């Protein structure tokens, strides 16, 4: 979906653990935490086991940009998590072995 | 007996353009005074994503990973009168070096030798699983050009996790400076 092919590709094979505890009273502040994002915008897909950090402004679905042009936006989109919200926008901290 | 790209370099050639990783690629390397010394694999060519550098600086095989800011024509500048290496400019910026490795010290081949090509080193380059599959062939030939016909086995040297984002890549020349300047070397792209 969103963490696989844009932020961080695994392979169907070979992996370890998820280790995810509670970081309510940690990451998250009660009207927004802004500071961390996310990918959602690679021309292309990842292979499994890869990391990508281009600040370079991409289309979402794969289309090629030379910015001022079309659907070319930020690479990175916010979280927002809070304390007073649901385990799913609850921030947790995953260590994959 | 695949169609093999063949990027000669002459006096005035002087060719590592953005060449496709697409599936992995068979490198070759006919030297006679170890013209081609590195690459950088990557995707975005800046240092906005992460792209690993692999070289040979005459004294280790320094490997590594950071945001580099890839300097659009990347060179080893060696004085060809004097025969010692004086730039390595191949990267403005370095930050979130993510990999880090540099071999043993050592002292190679710097300056310029004449004749055939004295010695082949085959290389082979593949991203399966995140890592970095990086096999090496090497026998001795003698050879203008025209890349030989030939039966040898690569041997695996370096599994590496790197783990970053391959598309593309850019041979690393050396410029023989006696105002830029090359000798006679061939590399190969090998799909
Ligand atoms: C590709 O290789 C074949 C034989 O291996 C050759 O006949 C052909 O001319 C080559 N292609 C080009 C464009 O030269």
């Given at each position: 979906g969103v963490i696989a092919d844009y932020n961080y590709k695994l392979p169907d094979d070979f992996m370890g653990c998820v280790l995810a505890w509670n970081t309510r009273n940690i990451d998250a502040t009660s009207t927004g935490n802004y500071n961390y994002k996310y990918r959602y915008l690679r021309h292309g897909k990842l292979r499994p086991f890869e990391r990508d950090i281009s600040n370079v402004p991409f289309s979402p679905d794969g289309k090629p940009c030379?910015?001022?042009?079309?659907?070319?936006?930020?690479p990175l989109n916010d979280?927002?998590?809070?304390?007073?919200?649901?385990i799913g926008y609850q921030p947790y901290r995953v260590v994959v072995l | 007996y695949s169609n093999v790209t063949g990027f000669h370099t002459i006096n005035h050639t002087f060719g590592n353009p953005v060449i496709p990783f697409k599936d992995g690629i068979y490198f070759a390397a006919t030297e006679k005074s170890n013209v081609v010394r590195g690459w950088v694999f990557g995707?975005?060519?800046?240092?906005?994503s992460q792209s690993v550098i692999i070289i040979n600086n005459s004294t280790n095989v320094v490997i590594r990973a950071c945001n580099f800011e890839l300097c659009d024509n990347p060179f080893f500048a060696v004085s060809?009168?004097?025969?010692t290496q004086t730039h390595?400019?191949?990267?403005?910026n370095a930050f979130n070096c993510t990999f880090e490795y540099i071999s043993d010290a050592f002292s190679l081949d710097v300056s310029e030798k004449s004749g055939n090509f004295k010695h082949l080193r085959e290389f082979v380059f593949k991203n399966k699983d995140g890592f970095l599959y990086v096999y090496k062939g090497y026998q001795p030939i003698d050879v203008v050009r025209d890349l030989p016909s030939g039966f040898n086995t690569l041997k695996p040297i370096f599994k590496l996790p790197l783990g970053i984002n391959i598309t593309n890549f850019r041979a690393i020349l050396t410029a023989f400076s006696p105002i830029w300047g090359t000798s006679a070397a061939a590399y190969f792209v090998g799909y």
């Open positions: 030379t910015p001022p042009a079309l659907n070319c936006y930020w979280y927002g998590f809070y304390t007073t919200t649901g | 995707s975005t060519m800046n240092n906005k060809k009168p004097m025969g390595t400019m191949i990267f403005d």
